[PDB]
């Protein structure tokens, strides 16, 4: 791995100063270095929306749910702020528009509120019903 490419990851950037990655696989590792290669010339990251995600990353992010979520796991493990933020932008973009009646099925979100507390939170957030 290129010295600067590896340095782009905050996690690895430190351990070298003080390359096993027991919590990372070869495929996702290669995906990460590829993303950095596209982002290698990126200006130093100084709205948090998701309509501004890179198109090239989007195509690179046009992967399976398992692939995208393993990428997120790696980025959180590698503290790659740009990569993690772009993947989370995509995930939120998926979530947007969907109400719990759709999100829960979309991500097989095992329910955790009883009907009473469910109504309690809905009334605590009744403004949510407004569009």
């Amino acid at each position: 791995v290129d010295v600067e490419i590896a340095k782009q990851s905050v996690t690895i950037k430190t351990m070298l100063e003080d390359v096993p990655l027991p919590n990372v696989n070869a495929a996702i590792l290669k995906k990460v270095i590829q993303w950095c290669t596209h982002h290698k010339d990126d200006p130093p990251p100084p709205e948090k929306r998701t309509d501004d995600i890179p198109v090239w990353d989007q195509e690179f992010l046009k992967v399976d749910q398992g692939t995208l979520f393993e990428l997120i796991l790696a980025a959180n493990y590698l503290d790659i702020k740009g990569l993690l933020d772009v993947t989370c932008k995509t995930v939120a973009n998926m979530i947007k528009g969907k109400t719990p009646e759709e999100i829960r099925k979309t991500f097989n979100i095992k329910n955790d509120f009883t009907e009473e507390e469910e109504a309690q939170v809905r009334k605590e957030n009744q403004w949510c019903e407004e569009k």
């Binding site: 948090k48 929306r49 979520f69 997120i72 995930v91 719990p100 955790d112 509120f113």
Partner: protein
Amino acid sequence: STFVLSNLAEVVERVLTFLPAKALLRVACVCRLWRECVRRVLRTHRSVTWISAGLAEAGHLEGHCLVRVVAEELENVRILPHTVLYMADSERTSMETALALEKLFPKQCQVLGIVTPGIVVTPMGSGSNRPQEIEIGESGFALLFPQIEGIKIQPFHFIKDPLERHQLTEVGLLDNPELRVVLVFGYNYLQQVVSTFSDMNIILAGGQVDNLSSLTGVVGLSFSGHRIQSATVLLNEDVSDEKTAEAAMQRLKAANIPEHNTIGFMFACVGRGFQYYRAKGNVEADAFRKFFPSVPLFGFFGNGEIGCDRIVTGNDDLFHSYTTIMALIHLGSSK
């Protein structure tokens, strides 16, 4: 998917950070861990935002600007409103702004906002947009005040009924060990209310308006907080050109107010503006942006101006006309 959006708080918390407000509440009900994460995202909403109705908004057809703009711009807002600040142009005698806005906001949200002949709004998309003196135009912004831990910007609207202490003390104006600034907007009394708190180490922002349009006399906000810092300047007739205006704003900047978590409030005489500035408007706002590139410009043009140039940071004189009140409000930094 097995362990990503659940059992892993940082990922879900972040992804929610990349959501809007309405969807924030809607997805709050998905999971208890997700509910707590949206609670965190709400507690880190220590900021402000405003809708806008600026460039060529009216056109030949707009379809209820005061309604459509707020409805559409309540989609890319992350801060859960706790108090509403807004404006809109006035142009049988009726009104539906109090209906539209009060319907688009939480049932438990005090509403502030006024209708004035002119309004100052910073264009959206970035806080660095150029403020433009809108003396005439169908427009308006909606400044949303979320719950700011340690900053209770409590409004008030005391009417000129044919003034008891308890009424004022209720809202935190008098007998309040934390007030820092007031927004003295008076529609169609102003003296005594102003006097009730004038003899204090605060900053007095306000003016004279025509009519109010929302709150669940004189209306203002009892900005309370030690982290709050601000200052003001009086751009009187002596400030009537680029040289004088820029000198006055250099004096204002000398206070060294931070530009982070901060708002810019401009109050001016209705005469002050394009006509008063020899067929060239926005001079004061031009200097404002030049010396404060990021701060947004707000307030309004009123028949009266309330404020004395003062500076505060941690630890009849206010009555005048045909002048300006460059008022800057800075909310402090989170932790």
